[PDB]
Design a protein around this ligand. Structure first.
Ligand SMILES: [Cl-]
Length: 386
């Protein structure tokens, strides 16, 4: 019941990291290529201490389809922990080839500091629902099971602390079941287990990496009743824990297991969710061991961002935690949406969170930005609603 972290001085700081086209100093590539919106964050700390932040750079609108590039920023040094805006490099690109969709960043850092980045891809003229109008008036086809029309799974990696990235390699035939149309990996992050394997959450399955770090053999672990957008953590007991976006608004869907198989998914009544992506983080294993969870704690709204701690060996129950709105950002829209968390080298949690200007309401022209937050366990534990 005692957590020494509560006695530490509370710390928080927050600022926009991916600045949409409507903001002052909007984020653009060195090529001059700009983006209406940034969505779908992912963040990892590498073995050097450098922080890598990934996002979908949505070129023309905030929509999930059309020309979308996979963009990123690194901390300028391995030691600055992204503490202030000046600690971050300008926007770079992992991949932006063609006018199709490169997205769903799902990174994991291997033992050798190879940073793997799993990605989803679809063609320029396809969308999840089909019949969507593109900027030039073209009407999309519905994503289907054909090679051209299906969702692909790609893998790129960096061997130089995120400085450069390989041309992404298509692993669809190997790691996506045959006959699938729609697919998703993450988005958010994969993990490295105490036992040495990599686990990457995906739609209806886990991707498992075995063998030599940065030289892994990949395989698929099929799951029953998993969601499209999943998260994975190793709980203090050493078991695996999937915490997935539900198909309908309500609660997070949770299953527990091992590399040999999982039990059933069931709603976690303690974790309301509006059918949106979430994020989970293994903080520490020594007493008191902690798992961190972040989503919108609402059955209806994405604007109820809440970070929580679980002390349970199986992460059975999370505390109330703290509303991110307790440390609100101004000038970057209405915060809430997808999120991603890492530990920093200075004993903080670093979180990326989507934000929405809502200037076009629910419409395609509403600018979307991504906020970077740092806070310590003390900040969470000293929340007024605990
Ligand atoms: Cl969504």
């Amino acid at each position: 019941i005692n957590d020494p972290a509560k006695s530490a001085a509370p710390y928080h700081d927050e600022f926009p990291l991916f600045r949409s086209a409507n903001m002052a100093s909007p984020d653009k590539l060195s090529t001059g290529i700009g983006f209406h919106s940034f969505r779908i964050p992912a963040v990892v700390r590498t073995t050097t201490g450098r922080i890598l932040a990934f996002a979908e750079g949505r070129r023309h609108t905030n929509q999930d389809f059309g020309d979308i590039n996979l963009v990123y920023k690194r901390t300028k040094t391995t030691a600055n922990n992204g503490a202030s805006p000046s600690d971050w490099e300008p926007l770079r690109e992992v991949v932006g080839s063609g006018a199709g969709t490169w997205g769903n960043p799902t990174p994991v850092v291997d033992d050798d500091n190879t940073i793997y980045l799993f990605l989803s891809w679809n063609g320029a003229t396809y969308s999840q629902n089909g019949k969507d109008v593109l900027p030039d008036g073209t009407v999309t086809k519905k994503i289907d099971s054909t090679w051209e029309g299906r969702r692909h799974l790609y893998l790129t990696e960096s061997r130089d602390d995120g400085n450069t990235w390989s041309k992404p390699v298509d692993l669809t035939k190997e790691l996506t079941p045959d006959g699938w149309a729609w697919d998703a990996v993450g988005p958010g992050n994969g993990i490295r287990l105490t036992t040495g394997e990599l686990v990457i959450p995906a739609m209806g399955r886990n991707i498992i990496g075995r063998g030599a770090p940065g030289n892994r053999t990949w395989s698929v672990q099929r799951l029953s009743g998993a969601g499209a957008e999943g998260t994975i953590v190793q709980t203090p007991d050493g078991k695996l824990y999937r915490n997935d976006r539900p198909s309908q608004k309500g609660y997070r869907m949770v299953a527990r297991g091992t590399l040999e198989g999982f039990g059933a998914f069931a709603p976690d009544a303690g974790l309301p969710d509006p059918a949106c992506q979430g994020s989970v983080l293994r903080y520490n294993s020594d007493a008191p061991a902690r798992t961190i969870f972040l989503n919108s704690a609402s059955g209806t709204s994405r604007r109820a961002m809440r970070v929580r701690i679980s002390y349970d060996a199986d992460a059975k129950k999370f505390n109330y935690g703290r509303k991110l709105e307790d440390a609100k950002v101004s000038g970057a829209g209405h915060e809430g949406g997808y999120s991603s968390m890492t530990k920093t080298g200075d004993y903080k949690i670093g979180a990326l969170v989507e934000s929405d200007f809502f200037n076009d309401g629910t419409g395609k022209n509403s600018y979307r930005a991504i906020i970077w937050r740092r806070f310590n366990l003390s900040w969470i534990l000293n929340g007024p609603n605990n």
